[PDB]
Amino acid sequence: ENIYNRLGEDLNKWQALLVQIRKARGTFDNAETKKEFGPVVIDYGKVQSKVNLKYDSWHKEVLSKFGQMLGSNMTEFHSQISKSRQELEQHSVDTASTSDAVTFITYVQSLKRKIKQFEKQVELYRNGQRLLEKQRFQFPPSWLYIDNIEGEWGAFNDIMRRKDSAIQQQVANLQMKIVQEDRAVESRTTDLLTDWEKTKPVTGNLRPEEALQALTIYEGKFGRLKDDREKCAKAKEALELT
Amino acid sequence: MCDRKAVIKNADMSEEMQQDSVECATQALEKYNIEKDIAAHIKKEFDKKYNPTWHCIVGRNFGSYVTHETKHFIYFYLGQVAILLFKSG
Amino acid sequence: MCDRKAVIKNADMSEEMQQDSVECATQALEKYNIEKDIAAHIKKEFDKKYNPTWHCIVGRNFGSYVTHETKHFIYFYLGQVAILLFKSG
Amino acid sequence: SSILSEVSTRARSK
């Protein structure tokens, strides 16, 4: 517990500790059982064997601490591939609700960096598991093996860069759709303006309740117009190509 | 029981189905001795279990490249035998 | 030309696509030194020409029990090397 | 390197 707390969560530091203990054991290797100095005889082999057993047991149990977050990385593998299947089957150039599609496009650009991070994590994981088989690990049946996940992850990356890029270049249609949407929004804003100066109930002869209802209708449609304008602006800035 | 340790060399599955594949191939190996018959047994069991249709090969030296259904690919080893099983059809 | 004659084991398929398989596989074996790469080559070629999803298997001793659509099943050997190429998908 | 050595340097008492 003390050494684990001192190390904390660090896979590379863990591998450094593993190579340190491995080289310490390698240096410890010896055949003599008694170190003779003058007429003095000292037992050396019994404690040697006991502490070699100590080294072996501690090294073995330290290895067991690693099977956990590897399970975490396989869970990451699954959450990537299973969700990505539906995500790649989801979007298309049509379905003018593309404000959601461009949201997913921004999501996948944001996840490019996470994909790179997970790739270097997979590199560290493959080094660690290589250590694991050269440390004679009995592979559990429910353990998901390295080559399966690496192959399916490479396939995931290939499909992602094959399809998500393609749908990204053909955006000029989406660009002109956003253009016509925003010019319609501007026209509606000008119309709402003209309606505002025409509708000014600032005169007090009007009944407060009826003019209040009229202003409530105007404010409902004006909130709708503001929602349209803000959603067009957010779609434009998320797509960020126009 | 001969503890033939299983290693899975490429798979797009869930872990339960991968371990079921390991168990089915182990039972086939303990049951038959003909690689064609081993493939027949494992593929028939898989068609009965997770619906048709599968494709399986049993051998010691064979390299493969195949397109499969998503979440329906596996390739593992049992002893000195390579066990591939994909779903396309 | 490597006079490894074309001897054929299983065939539920046409003769012209027999010869297409034969020439393409001769080319694939003569080009690549990896059975896995040769299988990928022949699968890709039969996906380009005879449409997906063909499956190719290259080996020297193996057990084959696969489901093919009719007219899409070949099994044969070259010199010693074995080749399997069926479609399903 | 070390680490395994440096952790061992904090023996509790004497």
Characterization of this structure:
This is part of a larger assembly, with one copy of chain A (242 residues), two copies of chain B (89 residues) and one copy of chain D (14 residues). Chain A is mainly α and 242 residues long. Chain A has helices at 2-7, 11-28, 45-64, 67-90, 98-134, 146-169, 172-199, 208-239. With 89 residues, chain B is an alpha+beta fold. Chain B has two helices and four strands. Chain B has a four-stranded antiparallel β-sheet with strand order 1-3-4-2. By secondary structure, chain D is mostly helical. In chain D, 36% of the residues lie in helices and 0% in strands. Chain D contains one helix and no strands. The longest helix of chain D is centred in the middle third of the chain and has 5 residues, at 4-8. The radius of gyration of chain D is 8 Å and the shape is rod-shaped. In chain D, 0% of the residues are buried. The chains are: A mainly alpha (242), B alpha+beta (89), D mainly alpha (14). The interface between B and C is medium-sized, with 26 and 28 residues.
Describe this protein with a few key phrases:
part of a larger assembly; 4 chains; A: 242 residues; mainly alpha; 8 helices; D: 14 residues; Cytoplasmic dynein 1 light intermediate chain 2 (chain D)
The residue fraction in helices of chain A comes out at over 70%
Measure the end-to-end span of chain D: 27 Å
- Shape of chain A, please? elongated
Number of strands of chain A: 0
Helix content of chain D: 25-40%
As a whole number of angstroms, the C-alpha radius of gyration of chain A is 33 Å
How many strands, what sense, and barrel or not for the largest sheet of chain A? Answer: none
Number of helices of chain D: 1
Instruction: Determine the most extensive contact between two protein chains.
Output: B-C, 26 and 28 residues
Q: Rg of chain D to the nearest angstrom? A: 8 Å
N-to-C terminal Cα separation of chain A, in Å? 56 Å
Task: Give the percentage of residues in beta strands of chain D.
Answer: under 5%
